[PDB]
Amino acid sequence: VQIVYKPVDLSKVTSKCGSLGNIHHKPGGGQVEVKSEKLDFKDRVQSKIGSLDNITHVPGGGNKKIETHKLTF
Amino acid sequence: VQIVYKPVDLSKVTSKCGSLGNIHHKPGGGQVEVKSEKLDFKDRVQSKIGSLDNITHVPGGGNKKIETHKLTF
Amino acid sequence: VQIVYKPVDLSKVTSKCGSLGNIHHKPGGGQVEVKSEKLDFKDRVQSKIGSLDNITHVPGGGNKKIETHKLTF
Amino acid sequence: VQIVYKPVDLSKVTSKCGSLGNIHHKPGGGQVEVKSEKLDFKDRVQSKIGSLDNITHVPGGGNKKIETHKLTF
Amino acid sequence: VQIVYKPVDLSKVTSKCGSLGNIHHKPGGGQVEVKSEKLDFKDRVQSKIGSLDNITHVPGGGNKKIETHKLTF
Amino acid sequence: VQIVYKPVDLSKVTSKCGSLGNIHHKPGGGQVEVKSEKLDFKDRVQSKIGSLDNITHVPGGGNKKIETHKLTF
Amino acid sequence: VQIVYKPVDLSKVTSKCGSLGNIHHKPGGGQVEVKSEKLDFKDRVQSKIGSLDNITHVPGGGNKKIETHKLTF
Amino acid sequence: VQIVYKPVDLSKVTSKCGSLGNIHHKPGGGQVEVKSEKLDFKDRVQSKIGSLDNITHVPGGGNKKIETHKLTF
Amino acid sequence: VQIVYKPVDLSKVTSKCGSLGNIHHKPGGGQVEVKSEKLDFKDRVQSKIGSLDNITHVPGGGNKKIETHKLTF
Amino acid sequence: VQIVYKPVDLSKVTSKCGSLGNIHHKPGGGQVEVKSEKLDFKDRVQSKIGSLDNITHVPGGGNKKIETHKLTF
């Protein structure tokens, strides 16, 4: 049994911008209201209850490269 | 049994920007209200209750490269 | 049994910016209100209750490179 | 049984900026109010209750490189 | 049984900035109010209750490199 | 009177060459004869009189980028 | 009167070459003869009279970038 | 009168070369003869008269970047 | 009158070369003859008369960066 | 009158070379003959008359950076 694993990757991911310009994020307000009584969470439970998220995300390029390499034997 | 694992990676991820410009994040206000009584969390539970998040994120490039390499035998 | 693990990585992740510009983060105010009575947390529970987060994050580049290499035998 | 683990990494992560510019973080105020009575935390519980976080984070580059290498036998 | 562990790392993480500019962090005020009665914490519990955090963090580069190398046999 | 000048240039000038080959500059000779009596040269005056030039110029890439910006008022 | 000058230049000028080959500059000879009587040279006057130039110039890349910025008022 | 001058330059000028090969500068000889009587040279006057130049110039890259900035008022 | 001058330069000028090869500068000889009677040289006057130059210049990279900044008022 | 001068320069000029090879400067000889009677040289006057120069210049990198800043008022 001879196994040779030799993949080759010379790739590129790129971006360029002259400018991103003016960004204005001015949402109005709001309310989140939640009523509950009894809460029971067990065994790898992930959660959020009741939230308001105001997010401005402006990266000067945000390229992503993901590689998974696996050999099972 | 001979196993040779020799992948090759010469890749690149890049970004460039002249300028990002002016960013104005001015959201209005708000309310988050939660009523509960009894809360029981067990065994690897992850959570948040009741939150307001105002986030401005402006990286001058935020590229990501992720690699996973595994051999199981 | 002969196993040779010799991956090669000559990659790069880069970013450049002329300037990031002016950033103005001026959100209005708010309220977070939570009512509870009895709280019971057991066995690796991670949480937060009731929070207001005003975050400005402006890195001059924040690229990330993550590598996982594992051999199981 | 012969195992050779010799990965090679010549990578780089870099960033450069002309300037980051003026950053103005001036959020309005707020209230966080929490009512509870009985709190019981056991066995590796991590938490926070009731907080207001005003954070300005402006690194002159904050690139990250993470490597995990493990061999199990 | 012969095991040779000889990974090689010649990587670099770098950053440079012309200037970071003027940073003005001037948030308004606020209140955090918490009512509780009975609190019981046991066995590796980590927490904070009731806090106001005003943080300005401006490193002249804050790159991070993390390496984990482990061999189990 | 408000005047804003902010041009952006992200251009590139490049060349690649496999080899420079074999270059032979083997001109024959010659004679240059100049006869005059009176020479009157004044105020931003230049001359080249009576010359033989054998010039070999072989740059391994010799690209040029010329630029200029001006404002008057 | 408000005047703002902030041009941005992220350009590059480059070259690559595999080898410079074989360059042979083997010109024959020559004669330059200049005859005159009276020489009157004044005020920003320059000259080259009577010369033989054998020049070999082989830069391993000789790119040029010229720049200039000016404002008057 | 408010004048702001803040140009940004992140440019690069580069070259790469595999070898410089074989350069042979083997010109034949020559004669330069200049005959005159009266020489009157005054006020910012320069000359080169009667010369033989055998020049070999082989820089291993000789790129140039010229720059200038000026404001008047 | 408020004048602000803050240009930013993060540029680079570079070169790389594998070897400088074999350079042979083997010119033949020559004669330079200059005949005159009266020499009158005054006020910022320079000359080179009657010369033979055998010059070999082989810098292992000889890049130049020239710069200048000026303001008047 | 408020004048602020704060230019920033983070540039680099560099070179790398594998070897300097074999350089042979073997010119033949020659004669330089200059004949005159009266020499009148005054006030910032310089000359080179009657010379033979055999020059070998081989710096192992000889990059130059020239700079200047001036303000008048």
XYZ file of C-alpha atoms in Angstrom:
730
model
C 0.000 0.000 0.000
C 1.498 3.245 -1.182
C -0.374 6.490 -0.877
C 0.933 9.763 -2.114
C -0.906 12.931 -1.304
C 0.631 15.922 -3.051
C -1.950 18.459 -4.205
C -0.613 21.782 -5.387
C -2.222 25.198 -4.865
C -0.840 28.425 -6.379
C -4.113 30.346 -6.321
C -4.893 33.869 -5.344
C -7.846 35.859 -4.191
C -7.595 39.582 -4.512
C -9.394 42.866 -4.391
C -8.744 46.506 -4.955
C -10.773 49.649 -4.561
C -10.289 53.250 -5.483
C -12.434 54.324 -2.557
C -15.369 53.060 -0.612
C -17.296 56.360 -0.369
C -19.551 57.718 2.319
C -21.676 55.384 4.292
C -24.521 56.625 6.387
C -26.313 54.209 8.658
C -29.067 55.975 10.543
C -31.925 53.575 11.327
C -34.760 54.596 13.525
C -35.340 53.077 16.913
C -37.322 50.171 18.156
C -38.518 47.797 20.773
C -38.061 44.175 21.436
C -40.291 42.715 24.079
C -40.366 39.169 25.244
C -42.428 37.465 27.878
C -41.601 33.994 29.122
C -41.769 32.247 32.459
C -39.840 29.002 32.664
C -36.750 28.304 30.651
C -34.828 25.040 30.567
C -31.785 24.537 28.378
C -29.814 21.292 28.307
C -26.944 19.683 26.433
C -25.138 21.863 23.919
C -27.815 24.426 23.432
C -26.806 27.765 21.974
C -29.137 30.724 21.994
C -29.995 34.325 22.395
C -33.146 35.900 23.595
C -34.166 39.484 23.093
C -31.654 41.576 21.205
C -31.134 44.664 19.135
C -28.102 44.690 16.830
C -26.892 47.820 14.993
C -23.864 46.772 13.000
C -21.786 48.635 10.487
C -19.086 46.498 8.885
C -16.836 48.050 6.278
C -13.631 46.112 5.707
C -11.161 47.344 3.124
C -11.367 43.931 1.534
C -12.413 40.787 3.312
C -11.675 37.894 1.068
C -11.697 34.398 2.479
C -9.908 31.201 1.590
C -10.812 27.985 3.272
C -9.037 24.672 2.832
C -9.817 21.296 4.278
C -7.490 18.390 3.689
C -8.052 15.082 5.249
C -6.928 11.576 4.801
C -8.623 8.742 6.584
C -7.215 5.284 6.743
C 2.291 0.709 4.192
C 3.841 3.919 2.979
C 2.017 7.193 3.244
C 3.377 10.433 1.975
C 1.581 13.636 2.746
C 3.169 16.586 0.970
C 0.629 19.147 -0.219
C 2.019 22.436 -1.432
C 0.460 25.882 -0.952
C 1.894 29.071 -2.498
C -1.351 31.043 -2.469
C -2.080 34.587 -1.534
C -5.007 36.633 -0.410
C -4.699 40.348 -0.772
C -6.450 43.659 -0.691
C -5.744 47.283 -1.294
C -7.726 50.460 -0.938
C -7.187 54.044 -1.899
C -9.323 55.180 1.009
C -12.282 53.981 2.959
C -14.161 57.312 3.159
C -16.402 58.733 5.826
C -18.568 56.452 7.818
C -21.400 57.758 9.891
C -23.234 55.395 12.182
C -25.968 57.222 14.040
C -28.864 54.873 14.841
C -31.689 55.959 17.019
C -32.302 54.487 20.422
C -34.330 51.624 21.690
C -35.569 49.297 24.329
C -35.168 45.676 25.032
C -37.428 44.278 27.684
C -37.558 40.746 28.888
C -39.652 39.103 31.533
C -38.881 35.633 32.817
C -39.086 33.925 36.172
C -37.205 30.655 36.419
C -34.120 29.887 34.422
C -32.246 26.595 34.381
C -29.206 26.024 32.206
C -27.283 22.748 32.177
C -24.431 21.077 30.329
C -22.587 23.202 27.796
C -25.223 25.800 27.273
C -24.159 29.107 25.783
C -26.448 32.100 25.763
C -27.252 35.718 26.123
C -30.384 37.352 27.296
C -31.347 40.947 26.752
C -28.799 42.979 24.849
C -28.227 46.037 22.747
C -25.189 45.992 20.451
C -23.926 49.085 18.584
C -20.909 47.969 16.611
C -18.797 49.775 14.085
C -16.124 47.580 12.515
C -13.844 49.069 9.898
C -10.667 47.078 9.357
C -8.171 48.245 6.770
C -8.423 44.818 5.216
C -9.520 41.709 7.025
C -8.821 38.781 4.814
C -8.898 35.302 6.263
C -7.155 32.069 5.415
C -8.111 28.886 7.128
C -6.385 25.543 6.730
C -7.218 22.194 8.209
C -4.933 19.248 7.660
C -5.549 15.965 9.253
C -4.477 12.438 8.848
C -6.219 9.650 10.656
C -4.863 6.173 10.856
C 4.581 1.429 8.383
C 6.181 4.602 7.141
C 4.406 7.906 7.363
C 5.817 11.111 6.064
C 4.068 14.349 6.794
C 5.705 17.255 4.992
C 3.207 19.841 3.768
C 4.649 23.096 2.523
C 3.140 26.570 2.961
C 4.626 29.719 1.386
C 1.412 31.739 1.382
C 0.732 35.304 2.277
C -2.167 37.405 3.369
C -1.803 41.112 2.969
C -3.504 44.448 3.009
C -2.743 48.055 2.368
C -4.678 51.265 2.683
C -4.083 54.829 1.686
C -6.210 56.029 4.574
C -9.193 54.896 6.529
C -11.022 58.256 6.688
C -13.250 59.739 9.332
C -15.455 57.513 11.341
C -18.273 58.883 13.391
C -20.148 56.572 15.703
C -22.859 58.460 17.533
C -25.792 56.164 18.350
C -28.607 57.315 20.507
C -29.252 55.890 23.924
C -31.327 53.071 25.218
C -32.608 50.791 27.878
C -32.262 47.173 28.621
C -34.550 45.837 31.281
C -34.737 42.321 32.523
C -36.863 40.739 35.179
C -36.148 37.272 36.503
C -36.387 35.603 39.876
C -34.556 32.308 40.164
C -31.477 31.474 38.186
C -29.654 28.154 38.184
C -26.615 27.514 36.026
C -24.741 24.209 36.037
C -21.910 22.475 34.216
C -20.026 24.546 31.668
C -22.622 27.176 31.107
C -21.505 30.450 29.584
C -23.747 33.478 29.525
C -24.499 37.110 29.844
C -27.610 38.804 30.989
C -28.518 42.406 30.404
C -25.934 44.380 28.487
C -25.311 47.406 26.354
C -22.267 47.291 24.067
C -20.953 50.344 22.170
C -17.947 49.162 20.219
C -15.802 50.908 17.680
C -13.158 48.657 16.142
C -10.847 50.083 13.516
C -7.698 48.039 13.006
C -5.179 49.141 10.414
C -5.477 45.701 8.896
C -6.626 42.629 10.735
C -5.964 39.667 8.559
C -6.097 36.205 10.045
C -4.399 32.938 9.238
C -5.408 29.788 10.982
C -3.730 26.415 10.625
C -4.618 23.096 12.138
C -2.376 20.110 11.627
C -3.045 16.855 13.254
C -2.024 13.307 12.890
C -3.813 10.565 14.723
C -2.510 7.072 14.966
C 6.869 2.160 12.573
C 8.521 5.296 11.302
C 6.794 8.628 11.483
C 8.256 11.797 10.153
C 6.554 15.069 10.843
C 8.239 17.930 9.015
C 5.782 20.539 7.755
C 7.277 23.759 6.479
C 5.819 27.260 6.875
C 7.356 30.369 5.270
C 4.173 32.436 5.235
C 3.543 36.021 6.089
C 0.672 38.177 7.149
C 1.093 41.873 6.709
C -0.557 45.235 6.708
C 0.260 48.823 6.031
C -1.629 52.064 6.304
C -0.978 55.608 5.271
C -3.095 56.871 8.141
C -6.100 55.803 10.097
C -7.879 59.191 10.215
C -10.093 60.737 12.835
C -12.336 58.565 14.862
C -15.139 60.000 16.889
C -17.056 57.743 19.219
C -19.744 59.689 21.020
C -22.713 57.447 21.855
C -25.517 58.663 23.990
C -26.193 57.285 27.421
C -28.312 54.511 28.738
C -29.634 52.280 31.419
C -29.345 48.666 32.202
C -31.662 47.393 34.869
C -31.904 43.894 36.149
C -34.060 42.371 38.816
C -33.401 38.909 40.179
C -33.674 37.282 43.569
C -31.894 33.963 43.899
C -28.823 33.061 41.939
C -27.048 29.714 41.980
C -24.014 29.006 39.837
C -22.189 25.675 39.889
C -19.378 23.879 38.097
C -17.457 25.893 35.531
C -20.012 28.556 34.935
C -18.842 31.797 33.379
C -21.039 34.856 33.281
C -21.737 38.502 33.558
C -24.825 40.255 34.675
C -25.678 43.862 34.048
C -23.059 45.777 32.118
C -22.385 48.771 29.954
C -19.337 48.584 27.677
C -17.973 51.597 25.752
C -14.978 50.350 23.822
C -12.800 52.036 21.271
C -10.185 49.729 19.765
C -7.845 51.092 17.131
C -4.727 48.995 16.653
C -2.183 50.031 14.057
C -2.529 46.581 12.576
C -3.729 43.546 14.444
C -3.104 40.552 12.302
C -3.294 37.108 13.825
C -1.643 33.807 13.059
C -2.703 30.691 14.835
C -1.075 27.290 14.519
C -2.016 24.001 16.066
C 0.183 20.977 15.593
C -0.541 17.751 17.254
C 0.429 14.184 16.932
C -1.407 11.489 18.788
C -0.155 7.979 19.073
C 9.157 2.903 16.762
C 10.858 6.000 15.462
C 9.180 9.359 15.602
C 10.694 12.492 14.242
C 9.039 15.795 14.891
C 10.771 18.611 13.037
C 8.358 21.243 11.741
C 9.904 24.426 10.435
C 8.496 27.951 10.789
C 10.085 31.022 9.155
C 6.932 33.135 9.088
C 6.354 36.737 9.901
C 3.512 38.947 10.929
C 3.990 42.631 10.451
C 2.389 46.016 10.408
C 3.262 49.584 9.694
C 1.421 52.857 9.928
C 2.128 56.379 8.857
C 0.021 57.704 11.707
C -3.005 56.703 13.665
C -4.733 60.118 13.741
C -6.930 61.725 16.338
C -9.212 59.609 18.381
C -12.000 61.108 20.384
C -13.956 58.905 22.733
C -16.620 60.911 24.504
C -19.625 58.722 25.354
C -22.416 60.004 27.467
C -23.122 58.672 30.911
C -25.287 55.945 32.252
C -26.650 53.763 34.952
C -26.417 50.153 35.775
C -28.758 48.944 38.450
C -29.058 45.463 39.766
C -31.244 44.002 42.444
C -30.641 40.546 43.846
C -30.948 38.959 47.253
C -29.218 35.618 47.624
C -26.155 34.649 45.682
C -24.430 31.278 45.764
C -21.401 30.501 43.639
C -19.626 27.143 43.735
C -16.838 25.287 41.968
C -14.880 27.244 39.387
C -17.393 29.938 38.754
C -16.170 33.144 37.168
C -18.321 36.234 37.029
C -18.965 39.893 37.265
C -22.030 41.703 38.353
C -22.827 45.316 37.685
C -20.174 47.171 35.742
C -19.450 50.130 33.548
C -16.397 49.874 31.283
C -14.983 52.844 29.329
C -12.002 51.532 27.421
C -9.791 53.157 24.859
C -7.208 50.796 23.386
C -4.841 52.095 20.745
C -1.751 49.947 20.299
C 0.815 50.917 17.699
C 0.422 47.456 16.255
C -0.829 44.460 18.153
C -0.242 41.433 16.045
C -0.488 38.010 17.604
C 1.116 34.677 16.878
C 0.004 31.597 18.685
C 1.582 28.168 18.411
C 0.587 24.911 19.991
C 2.742 21.849 19.558
C 1.967 18.652 21.251
C 2.884 15.068 20.970
C 1.003 12.421 22.851
C 2.200 8.897 23.177
C -14.173 79.074 -1.786
C -13.698 75.436 -0.994
C -11.321 73.437 -3.111
C -10.672 69.768 -2.741
C -8.021 67.853 -4.640
C -7.842 64.107 -4.038
C -6.983 62.099 -7.161
C -6.313 58.400 -6.753
C -3.740 56.314 -8.653
C -3.425 52.531 -8.171
C -1.773 51.832 -11.509
C 1.093 49.601 -12.455
C 3.719 49.516 -15.161
C 5.522 46.249 -15.586
C 7.510 43.962 -17.786
C 8.882 40.451 -17.866
C 11.517 38.912 -20.086
C 12.909 35.402 -20.430
C 16.455 36.299 -21.548
C 18.316 39.067 -23.256
C 19.841 36.976 -26.011
C 22.980 37.901 -27.932
C 23.635 41.482 -28.797
C 26.447 42.520 -31.036
C 27.277 46.117 -31.671
C 30.140 46.205 -34.121
C 30.025 49.397 -36.212
C 32.827 50.499 -38.429
C 34.714 53.701 -37.774
C 34.543 57.218 -39.028
C 35.601 60.805 -39.169
C 33.993 63.962 -37.998
C 35.541 67.222 -39.062
C 34.355 70.632 -38.069
C 35.959 73.891 -39.098
C 34.974 77.387 -37.909
C 36.532 80.669 -36.756
C 34.467 82.639 -34.205
C 32.196 81.196 -31.548
C 29.757 83.460 -29.637
C 27.548 81.529 -27.183
C 25.467 83.318 -24.522
C 22.486 82.915 -22.172
C 21.044 79.408 -21.927
C 22.908 78.075 -24.881
C 24.164 74.594 -25.329
C 25.835 72.615 -27.983
C 27.384 69.385 -29.006
C 29.853 69.825 -31.802
C 32.154 67.294 -33.281
C 31.374 63.935 -31.752
C 31.328 60.198 -32.285
C 29.055 58.122 -30.062
C 29.087 54.347 -29.818
C 26.346 53.524 -27.374
C 25.001 50.206 -26.250
C 22.093 50.399 -23.869
C 20.443 47.230 -22.778
C 18.444 47.639 -19.614
C 16.788 44.501 -18.221
C 13.544 46.422 -18.196
C 13.447 50.192 -18.230
C 9.912 51.301 -17.845
C 9.113 54.848 -16.886
C 6.334 56.526 -15.036
C 6.141 60.255 -15.185
C 3.772 62.253 -13.084
C 2.843 65.785 -12.136
C 0.217 67.667 -10.190
C -0.309 71.349 -9.888
C -2.736 73.908 -8.639
C -2.665 77.603 -8.928
C -4.801 80.222 -7.357
C -10.696 79.960 1.506
C -10.277 76.325 2.339
C -7.924 74.268 0.250
C -7.331 70.594 0.663
C -4.703 68.619 -1.207
C -4.582 64.877 -0.564
C -3.744 62.824 -3.663
C -3.130 59.119 -3.212
C -0.582 56.975 -5.082
C -0.326 53.193 -4.558
C 1.326 52.433 -7.883
C 4.160 50.150 -8.796
C 6.793 49.996 -11.492
C 8.548 46.699 -11.878
C 10.507 44.357 -14.046
C 11.828 40.826 -14.084
C 14.445 39.224 -16.279
C 15.785 35.691 -16.580
C 19.348 36.523 -17.698
C 21.255 39.242 -19.430
C 22.756 37.100 -22.158
C 25.915 37.957 -24.079
C 26.625 41.519 -24.980
C 29.460 42.490 -27.223
C 30.344 46.067 -27.894
C 33.215 46.087 -30.337
C 33.154 49.256 -32.462
C 35.979 50.291 -34.683
C 37.911 53.473 -34.056
C 37.796 56.978 -35.349
C 38.908 60.548 -35.526
C 37.344 63.741 -34.394
C 38.944 66.966 -35.488
C 37.805 70.403 -34.536
C 39.461 73.626 -35.596
C 38.524 77.150 -34.447
C 40.129 80.420 -33.326
C 38.085 82.448 -30.801
C 35.785 81.069 -28.135
C 33.375 83.389 -26.257
C 31.131 81.518 -23.789
C 29.069 83.366 -21.154
C 26.075 83.034 -18.809
C 24.581 79.551 -18.530
C 26.432 78.159 -21.463
C 27.637 74.654 -21.870
C 29.287 72.622 -24.498
C 30.790 69.358 -25.481
C 33.274 69.732 -28.274
C 35.541 67.150 -29.719
C 34.706 63.821 -28.156
C 34.607 60.079 -28.647
C 32.295 58.061 -26.410
C 32.271 54.289 -26.124
C 29.511 53.534 -23.681
C 28.114 50.249 -22.524
C 25.202 50.510 -20.155
C 23.502 47.378 -19.035
C 21.501 47.852 -15.881
C 19.794 44.754 -14.460
C 16.579 46.723 -14.465
C 16.539 50.493 -14.540
C 13.018 51.660 -14.178
C 12.270 55.228 -13.260
C 9.511 56.967 -11.436
C 9.373 60.697 -11.626
C 7.029 62.752 -9.554
C 6.150 66.308 -8.647
C 3.547 68.251 -6.729
C 3.075 71.943 -6.470
C 0.683 74.550 -5.256
C 0.809 78.241 -5.584
C -1.292 80.910 -4.049
C -7.214 80.831 4.798
C -6.852 77.199 5.672
C -4.525 75.084 3.614
C -3.987 71.407 4.067
C -1.383 69.374 2.227
C -1.320 65.638 2.911
C -0.505 63.538 -0.162
C 0.053 59.829 0.330
C 2.574 57.627 -1.509
C 2.773 53.848 -0.944
C 4.422 53.028 -4.254
C 7.225 50.692 -5.134
C 9.862 50.470 -7.821
C 11.569 47.143 -8.165
C 13.499 44.750 -10.302
C 14.767 41.199 -10.298
C 17.367 39.533 -12.468
C 18.655 35.978 -12.727
C 22.233 36.745 -13.842
C 24.186 39.417 -15.597
C 25.662 37.223 -18.298
C 28.838 38.011 -20.217
C 29.605 41.552 -21.156
C 32.460 42.456 -23.400
C 33.400 46.013 -24.108
C 36.277 45.962 -26.541
C 36.270 49.110 -28.701
C 39.116 50.079 -30.924
C 41.093 53.238 -30.326
C 41.035 56.729 -31.658
C 42.200 60.281 -31.869
C 40.681 63.508 -30.778
C 42.332 66.697 -31.902
C 41.241 70.161 -30.989
C 42.948 73.347 -32.079
C 42.061 76.897 -30.972
C 43.711 80.156 -29.881
C 41.691 82.241 -27.385
C 39.363 80.925 -24.712
C 36.982 83.302 -22.866
C 34.703 81.491 -20.384
C 32.661 83.398 -17.776
C 29.657 83.136 -15.436
C 28.110 79.679 -15.125
C 29.948 78.228 -18.037
C 31.102 74.701 -18.402
C 32.729 72.616 -21.003
C 34.186 69.320 -21.945
C 36.683 69.625 -24.735
C 38.916 66.995 -26.145
C 38.027 63.695 -24.548
C 37.873 59.950 -25.000
C 35.526 57.992 -22.747
C 35.445 54.223 -22.421
C 32.666 53.536 -19.978
C 31.216 50.285 -18.790
C 28.302 50.616 -16.433
C 26.552 47.522 -15.284
C 24.549 48.060 -12.141
C 22.793 45.003 -10.692
C 19.607 47.020 -10.728
C 19.623 50.789 -10.844
C 16.120 52.011 -10.505
C 15.422 55.601 -9.628
C 12.684 57.400 -7.832
C 12.604 61.130 -8.062
C 10.283 63.242 -6.021
C 9.455 66.820 -5.154
C 6.875 68.822 -3.266
C 6.458 72.523 -3.048
C 4.100 75.179 -1.869
C 4.284 78.863 -2.237
C 2.218 81.580 -0.738
C -3.730 81.685 8.093
C -3.424 78.059 9.006
C -1.123 75.887 6.978
C -0.642 72.207 7.473
C 1.936 70.115 5.663
C 1.943 66.387 6.388
C 2.735 64.241 3.339
C 3.235 60.531 3.874
C 5.728 58.271 2.067
C 5.870 54.496 2.674
C 7.515 53.615 -0.624
C 10.286 51.229 -1.469
C 12.927 50.938 -4.146
C 14.586 47.582 -4.449
C 16.486 45.138 -6.554
C 17.701 41.569 -6.507
C 20.281 39.841 -8.650
C 21.518 36.265 -8.868
C 25.110 36.966 -9.980
C 27.107 39.589 -11.758
C 28.559 37.343 -14.430
C 31.751 38.065 -16.349
C 32.573 41.583 -17.323
C 35.448 42.420 -19.568
C 36.442 45.954 -20.311
C 39.327 45.835 -22.735
C 39.373 48.958 -24.929
C 42.239 49.860 -27.155
C 44.261 52.996 -26.584
C 44.259 56.473 -27.954
C 45.477 60.004 -28.200
C 44.003 63.265 -27.148
C 45.705 66.417 -28.302
C 44.664 69.907 -27.431
C 46.420 73.055 -28.550
C 45.583 76.629 -27.484
C 47.279 79.875 -26.424
C 45.282 82.017 -23.956
C 42.927 80.765 -21.276
C 40.577 83.197 -19.463
C 38.264 81.448 -16.969
C 36.245 83.412 -14.388
C 33.229 83.220 -12.054
C 31.630 79.791 -11.710
C 33.455 78.281 -14.600
C 34.558 74.733 -14.924
C 36.160 72.597 -17.497
C 37.570 69.269 -18.400
C 40.080 69.507 -21.185
C 42.277 66.828 -22.560
C 41.334 63.560 -20.929
C 41.126 59.813 -21.342
C 38.743 57.915 -19.075
C 38.605 54.152 -18.708
C 35.810 53.533 -16.266
C 34.308 50.317 -15.047
C 31.393 50.716 -12.702
C 29.594 47.660 -11.526
C 27.589 48.263 -8.395
C 25.783 45.249 -6.917
C 22.628 47.312 -6.986
C 22.700 51.079 -7.142
C 19.215 52.357 -6.827
C 18.568 55.966 -5.991
C 15.854 57.825 -4.224
C 15.829 61.553 -4.494
C 13.535 63.721 -2.482
C 12.757 67.320 -1.657
C 10.203 69.381 0.201
C 9.840 73.090 0.379
C 7.519 75.795 1.521
C 7.759 79.471 1.113
C 5.729 82.233 2.577
C -0.243 82.524 11.387
C 0.006 78.903 12.341
C 2.281 76.676 10.344
C 2.706 72.995 10.880
C 5.257 70.845 9.101
C 5.206 67.125 9.866
C 5.975 64.935 6.843
C 6.419 61.223 7.419
C 8.883 58.907 5.644
C 8.966 55.138 6.292
C 10.607 54.196 3.010
C 13.344 51.760 2.199
C 15.989 51.400 -0.466
C 17.598 48.018 -0.728
C 19.469 45.522 -2.800
C 20.629 41.936 -2.712
C 23.190 40.147 -4.828
C 24.373 36.551 -5.003
C 27.979 37.186 -6.111
C 30.020 39.760 -7.912
C 31.446 37.464 -10.555
C 34.653 38.116 -12.472
C 35.531 41.612 -13.482
C 38.425 42.381 -15.727
C 39.474 45.891 -16.505
C 42.362 45.703 -18.919
C 42.461 48.801 -21.147
C 45.347 49.636 -23.373
C 47.415 52.748 -22.832
C 47.468 56.209 -24.238
C 48.740 59.719 -24.519
C 47.311 63.013 -23.506
C 49.063 66.126 -24.690
C 48.071 69.641 -23.860
C 49.878 72.750 -25.008
C 49.092 76.348 -23.982
C 50.832 79.579 -22.951
C 48.861 81.777 -20.514
C 46.480 80.590 -17.828
C 44.161 83.076 -16.048
C 41.815 81.388 -13.543
C 39.818 83.411 -10.989
C 36.793 83.290 -8.663
C 35.141 79.888 -8.286
C 36.952 78.319 -11.154
C 38.003 74.753 -11.436
C 39.580 72.564 -13.980
C 40.944 69.207 -14.844
C 43.464 69.377 -17.624
C 45.625 66.651 -18.962
C 44.630 63.415 -17.300
C 44.366 59.667 -17.672
C 41.949 57.830 -15.391
C 41.753 54.073 -14.984
C 38.943 53.522 -12.544
C 37.389 50.342 -11.296
C 34.474 50.811 -8.964
C 32.626 47.796 -7.760
C 30.622 48.461 -4.641
C 28.767 45.491 -3.137
C 25.643 47.600 -3.237
C 25.772 51.364 -3.434
C 22.305 52.697 -3.143
C 21.710 56.323 -2.349
C 19.017 58.242 -0.610
C 19.049 61.967 -0.920
C 16.783 64.191 1.061
C 16.056 67.810 1.844
C 13.527 69.929 3.673
C 13.219 73.643 3.808
C 10.936 76.395 4.914
C 11.231 80.062 4.467
C 9.238 82.871 5.895
